[PDB]
């Protein structure tokens, strides 16, 4: 039960998703965030 934001084309950083990218929801943990 996990979510991979890499297959959608977005990326998962370690800090809150930067405004330079869009929010694809959440990443593996709350400490990381997906971006696109």
* Beta strands, count: 2
- Name the overall outline: globular
Order of helices and strands: EE
* CATH architecture group name: Roll
Number of domains: 1
Distance between the termini: 21 Å
Which class of secondary structure composition applies to the elements?
A: mainly beta
Strand content: 15-25%
The top-level CATH class is Alpha Beta
GO cellular component, one term: extracellular region
Protein name: Beta-defensin 1
Subunit structure: Monomer. Homodimer.
Subcellular location: Secreted; Membrane
Structure description:
With 36 residues, this protein is mostly beta strands. The chain has a single domain, classed as Antimicrobial Peptide, Beta-defensin 2, Chain A (Roll), CATH 3.10.360. The chain has no helices and 2 strands. Strands 1-2 form a two-stranded antiparallel sheet. It is globular, with a radius of gyration of 9 Å. Monomer. Homodimer.
Q: How would you concisely characterize the structure shown here?
A:
The protein has 36 residues and is mainly beta. The protein has strands spanning 11-13, 33-35. It has one domain (1-36): Roll (Antimicrobial Peptide, Beta-defensin 2, Chain A).
Pick out its properties.
about 35 residues, defensin, mainly beta, human, beta-defensin 1, monomeric, two-stranded antiparallel ribbon, Antimicrobial Peptide, Beta-defensin 2, Chain A
Set out the fold topology:
Elements: E1 11-13, E2 33-35
Antiparallel strand pairs: 1-2
Subunit structure: Monomer. Homodimer.
Disulfide bonds: 5-34, 12-27, 17-35
Subcellular location: Secreted; Membrane
């Amino acid at each position: 039960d996990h979510y991979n934001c890499v297959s959608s084309g977005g990326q998962c950083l370690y800090s809150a998703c930067p405004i330079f990218t869009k929010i694809q929801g959440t990443c593996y943990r709350g400490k990381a965030k997906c971006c696109k």
